[PDB]
C-alpha cells in the first residue's frame, strides 16, 4: 500500500563549485501525489581559504533574512566564532595541542580549562565556569606507586569532582574495565565549587552516603556480573560467539532467580528468540533480503496466548508504513478483541504526513499530562483516530490535526515559529511569530514550558529546574551531562513533600520524604538497556503499599 507517485522525479542534488565544495543541496518536496514537486535549495557559502562560513536553510532564503550560521575560522580550519541563529554565539579558543582553553557560550558564560604544567604530561586538572567564579570540576590523577599498580590505577583519574559531586575509581581490570567505583552526591544547599588544594573541605559539601558498585569481567573485558550499590547482583553468561545468552539476579539476602534463561540470535547478530524467567517467549522475525525487523511475536506458553504480534511493513527505503497486531485486545477492554491497523504515509522528504491508530475514549485533548489508566473494572473501550501533520520548508512540525471520528474530539494544535529561527513554541504560549525568540534563552534553550511554567537552566545549558506553580522540580548532572538526581518538591500541605531519585549503575533509589521522616523508600533494580526489553525489580525498604507484593 505504498504509492510511488510521491517520489517520482524527486532526487537529491548536491551542487558543487569549482573547488568541488558542496555549495547547494537540492531537494524536491511533493506532499500529495497529484501535485508538482517543490524545489528546496539549501545554501552553503564558503570563503576563499575554503571553509564553510555561512549556511542557509531554504525557508530563510525565501524570507530574505540572514543565514542560519555565521562561522569564523582560523588558518587551520577550526571554528573561532559560531553565530548560530538557534544556538546563539559560541567563542572557542584552543591551544597548540588542540585542547580547549576558553569557551564562551551564548549566555555569556566563560568556561576555562587549566591543565598540568610543562613538566607534567599536561592532563586536565580543573574547569572554571566564570559568570562570579566557580571551579566547577576538579580532576585528581594518580601516580605509579606499587599500591596504584596493584589495582591498575596508574595514570587514571581516581577522584573526579564534577557538577554533581565525586566519582571515585577504585579498581581496573587487566583490559581496562572498571571493576569498582564509588560516588557521593553534593548536598541540596550546595553547588560545585571545588576551590583550593585540600580535599578535606570538599567532603563537607558531599553527602555521607558513599555508593560503591562492583563488577567482574572476563579476559575479553565483557562484563560478567555486577553488584549494585545495595548488594543486588546481576550475573550474565555469554555464548561461543561472544553474544549474551543468559541473566540471573540475586537480591541481597535472597537466592538466585532467573531473568533471561535463553537468548539466541540471527546470522547478523540481531535478537531472534528470547525466553524470560517469566516464561514468556518473544520471537523476532526479519526480512531475508534486507534484514529489517518485520515481526515481534510475544507468546506466553502456558495459555497458548499471543500477547502481542506486531508485523511491520516498509517502504523500499525503510520507512514504516504499516503496523498490524495479530493478537487480540487485552482484558482491560471489554466487548472487543480486534486491534486496528496503524497506517502511515510520508512526504518526498520522508516526513510523516498521516498516521492512524487506536486511542482511549476518555482521553480528551493531548497535553503534557498522561490520562488516567483503564482499570479492569470500568469496562471502557478504545476508538480509532487519525492524525495529519504539516511542515514548513525548514522541517519544523507546524500543525498536528488530530481528527478522531465516533467521539467528536477533532482538534488542531499549531506550533508558532519564528521568521529568523527554528525556535517555535506551542500556540497557547504565543500566536505572534515575532515574540517567539523572547521565550528562549540567548543559547536557544526554552525558558517557559507552558503558560504557568518556567524553566531554569545551568551555565552549561542543562535543565536546572521546571518551575510549576507551587511545586518545583530540580535536577543534577555529572561532567558528561547525564542526570544523577531528580528532586521533586511538592508544595506545603503543612510542610514540603519531597520525592528524590538517585540514578546509580543498575539501581534507582527512589525515595519520598516529608518534613522529618521518610515515608517511602524504593530501590528499583534495573536489568539491561532501556528500549531493549528491560526488566525492573521494585524492592521496598520502607513504606510499601498494601496491595502490591514486594
Amino acid at each position: 500500500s505504498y504509492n510511488s507517485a510521491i517520489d517520482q522525479k524527486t532526487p537529491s542534488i548536491k551542487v558543487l563549485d569549482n573547488r568541488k565544495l558542496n555549495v547547494r543541496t537540492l531537494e524536491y518536496l511533493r506532499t500529495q501525489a497529484d501535485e508538482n514537486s517543490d524545489e528546496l535549495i539549501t545554501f552553503y557559502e564558503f570563503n576563499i581559504p575554503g571553509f564553510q562560513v555561512k549556511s542557509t536553510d531554504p525557508r530563510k532564503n525565501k524570507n530574505q533574512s540572514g543565514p542560519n550560521f555565521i562561522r569564523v575560522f582560523n588558518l587551520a580550519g577550526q571554528v573561532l566564532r559560531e553565530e548560530s541563529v538557534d544556538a546563539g554565539r559560541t567563542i572557542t579558543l584552543n591551544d597548540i595541542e588542540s585542547r580547549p582553553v576558553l569557551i564562551i557560550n551564548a549566555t555569556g558564560v566563560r568556561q576555562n580549562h587549566r591543565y598540568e604544567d610543562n613538566t607534567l604530561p599536561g592532563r586536565l586538572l580543573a574547569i572554571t565556569e566564570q559568570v562570579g567564579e566557580k571551579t566547577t570540576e576538579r580532576l585528581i590523577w594518580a601516580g605509579n606507586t606499587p599500591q596504584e599498580k596493584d589495582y591498575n590505577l596508574a595514570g587514571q583519574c581516581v577522584r573526579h569532582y564534577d557538577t554533581a559531586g565525586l566519582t571515585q575509581l577504585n579498581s581496573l581490570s587487566l583490559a581496562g574495565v572498571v571493576l569498582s567505583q564509588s560516588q557521593q552526591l553534593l548536598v541540596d544547599d550546595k553547588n560545585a565549587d571545588w576551590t583550593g588544594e585540600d580535599q578535606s573541605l570538599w567532603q563537607q559539601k558531599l553527602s555521607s552516603d558513599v555508593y560503591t558498585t562492583q563488577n567482574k569481567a572476563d579476559a575479553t573485558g565483557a562484563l560478567l556480573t555486577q553488584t549494585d550499590a545495595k548488594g543486588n547482583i546481576q550475573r550474565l553468561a555469554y555464548d561461543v560467539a561472544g553474544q549474551l545468552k543468559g541473566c540471573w539476579l540475586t537480591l541481597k539476602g535472597q537466592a538466585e532467580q532467573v531473568i533471561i534463561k535463553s537468548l539466541t540470535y540471527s546470522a547478523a547478530g540481531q535478537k531472534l528468540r528470547e525466553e524470560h524467567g517469566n516464561g514468556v517467549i518473544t520471537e523476532y522475525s526479519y526480512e531475508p533480503e534486507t534484514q529489517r525487523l518485520i515481526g515481534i511475536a510475544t507468546r506466553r506458553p502456558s495459555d497458548a496466548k499471543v500477547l502481542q504480534d506486531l508485523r511491520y511493513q516498509y517502504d523500499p527505503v525503510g520507512n514504516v508504513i504499516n503496523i498490524r497486531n495479530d493478537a487480540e485486545a487485552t482484558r482491560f477492554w471489554r466487548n472487543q478483541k480486534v486491534v486496528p491497523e496503524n497506517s502511515y504515509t510520508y512526504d518526498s522528504l520522508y516526513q510523516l504526513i498521516s498516521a492512524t491508530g487506536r486511542e482511549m475514549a476518555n482521553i480528551g485533548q493531548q497535553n503534557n499530562q498522561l490520562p488516567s489508566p483503564a482499570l479492569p473494572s470500568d469496562n471502557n473501550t478504545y476508538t480509532n483516530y487519525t492524525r495529519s501533520y504539516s511542515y514548513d520548508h525548514s522541517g519544523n512540525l507546524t500543525q498536528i490535526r488530530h481528527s478522531s471520528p465516533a467521539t467528536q474530539n477533532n482538534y488542531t494544535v499549531a506550533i508558532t515559529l519564528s521568521n529568523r529561527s527554528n525556535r517555535g513554541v506551542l500556540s497557547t504560549l504565543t500566536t505572534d511569530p515575532n515574540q517567539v525568540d523572547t521565550l528562549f534563552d540567548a543559547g536557544g534553550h526554552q525558558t517557559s514550558l507552558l503558560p504557568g511554567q518556567t524553566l531554569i537552566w545551568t551555565p552549561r545549558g542543562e535543565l536546572k529546574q521546571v518551575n510549576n506553580g507551587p511545586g518545583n522540580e530540580w535536577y543534577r548532572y555529572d561532567s558528561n551531562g547525564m542526570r544523577q538526581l531528580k528532586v521533586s518538591e511538592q508544595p506545603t500541605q503543612n510542610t514540603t513533600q519531597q520525592q528524590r531519585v538517585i540514578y546509580l549503575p543498575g539501581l534507582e533509589l527512589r525515595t519520598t520524604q516529608s518534613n522529618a521522616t521518610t515515608t517511602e523508600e524504593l530501590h528499583v533494580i534495573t536489568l539491561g538497556e532501556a528500549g531493549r526489553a528491560q526488566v525492573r525489580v521494585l524492592h521496598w525498604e520502607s513504606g510499601k503499599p498494601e496491595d502490591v507484593n514486594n
Binding site: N215, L223, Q226, Q234, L236, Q243, L244, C247, G269, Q270, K271, Y284, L293, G318, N480, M482, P505, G506, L527, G528, E529, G531, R532
Partner: peptide, 16 residues
Amino acid sequence: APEKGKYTKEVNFFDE
C-alpha cells in the same frame, strides 16, 4: 543522533 530501530545494535547491559 536519529538512528534506526533498536534491534540493529549489539546488546549493552552496563556502560556510562
